[PDB]
């Protein structure tokens, strides 16, 4: 069985989305530089350490799906300069997203999260993303272009023994799911900064951590059309932080109006014919 | 040909959504009281008068579809006490919406707008709503439950001669649109406070104003699943105004997290497992 296609962020940029459209997955080698990975890790480190269990009794939106040995930290913009500057303005990410979502229009971040898997973390069941948040997605026609995609960026090594992600190539086109099995999977073996890109229809799962010693960390960036509601809110992010961002980063975090691809688009999140950013006089690229 | 079913807001409440599901339209008699209509009208009056043309060159999200003799005012919460208190907490609206959207989960306001049509306003072409903002909707399967519905509330009389809305009954189930014609329509003749309820698949249009003297006004409330992005933003609505609302009204305006109907729902617009309202310590029902 064939392995996940591996592509250069530098050289093969136009090939990335077409590869994912055909095969359901691709590995983007050095999607983030080692420097960006270093800074991201350093900045999110304490927030991962203080994060409670996914279904903590203190939470009013507990995640009952993730293993108790998973820590997920989202709303990364206030935590991480590297995320809000380097990642949110990634040339590679934006080329891929504009390739993927041109039929629909603007896209934004549905969720940007750091996930840390503890040693001995079990494999997840094979799944498609979005089914615990967006029931609408299951009602889309088979040939509907993907309305979200997920960049699974390695922040530490992904190996077969420490639980590297499994994917079933071609499974994004499957209607009948009788042949869903771990027998059909291949692995996303990745160095820090490499990213596995999948669609919302790609069948996949986190792998089993079998060493009992290694802690695997990733940055999962679910990008989706601006017509779908994000899993996370940036409403509470301080205005100085938002005003330090590029206009593009502001749009990605829901601090701007959005546009569809309809020929005479009337827009999303508008205010009496004007944008959020025009109405609120929102500044951009103002240093803290 | 059969007329639009007419139902009591008081007596026939459980019958309203089933009627719309079957026929694609229903008239809810006295959906709003005359007092609520009076107050709504008085409060929005000046904002309608100052509103420029839909495609005004000053706007960065111009509406190129609406006639130049239409004035549309959205983001009504800061304008109208009657809207944000009486309409957003309407028992009838919420019963209908929970009936309609139970398969998907929470719902919210995609757009609440007052539309005023000037004398001699031409009939709109027959259409389905949502096609200039949510291209995703066209890619839903035929049997997908409606993901949005539109309450067209009369704020002045709707008569055949002054441009009362046309609908084609049953057209919400149409796949082939070869028989789309004004020959197939019936009219929504309505007194102030009556509402025509349609789905996002009901084929309909505003009628021709033929008197040259009458100004027709309506309140259009597009309610949709919380998984779809609103056409309008309440991000710039002052916090004192938001904190005067009920928790339900806050949710409807995007000042709360949202939930899907998935058995182990992980939520929408959350912040590290907690809600917007918990995170921001958002007060409710605090008088101005
Ligand atoms: C333990 O087995 C699992 C089964 C299904 C899922 C799906 C997933 C999702 O739909 N979206 C995301 C996307 C990014 C990060 C986390 C999640 C997330 O929480 N779930 C539930 C996760 C785990
Ligand atoms: C002039 O002919 C027309 C053709 C189509 C439409 C559709 C409509 C929409 O999709 N949504 C709404 C919903 C509530 C109020 C206004 C609108 C709105 O602006 N358009 C464009 C309007 C007019
Ligand atoms: Cl994984
Ligand atoms: Cl109308
Ligand atoms: Ni997944
Ligand atoms: Ni319409």
Numbering used by the authors:
A (entry chain A), B (entry chain A): 8 to 295
Task: Share the article's original sentences.
On the other hand, starting with the synthesized desaturated intermediate 2 of the methylated natural substrate 1, the activity assays show similar turnover for the wt AsqJ and the V72I variant.
The active site of AsqJ forms a funnel like reaction chamber, located at the interface between antiparallel β-strands.
